[PDB]
């Protein structure tokens, strides 16, 4: 993490909005996580944030 995102396995320049799944402690781009606004991630973060991995594993 902090350099490679699982959704988009590629390097990036420290920029754009950042959001990290607390369950996995993984950093990833807000855009690749469906986040398009700072406000939306604010509320999402407040209610907790689940990465793409958590959704399928959490729900069976």
């Amino acid at each position: 993490s902090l350099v490679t995102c699982p959704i988009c396995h590629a390097p990036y320049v420290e920029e754009d909005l950042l959001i990290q799944c607390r369950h996995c402690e993984r950093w990833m781009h807000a855009g690749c996580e469906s986040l398009f606004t700072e406000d939306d991630v604010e509320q999402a973060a407040d209610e907790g944030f689940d990465c793409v991995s958590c959704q399928p594993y959490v729900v069976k």
Partner: peptide, 9 residues
């Protein structure tokens, strides 16, 4: 901590 962890940049 409470909720997810996100930063601005």
């Amino acid at each position: 901590g409470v909720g997810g962890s996100w930063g601005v940049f």
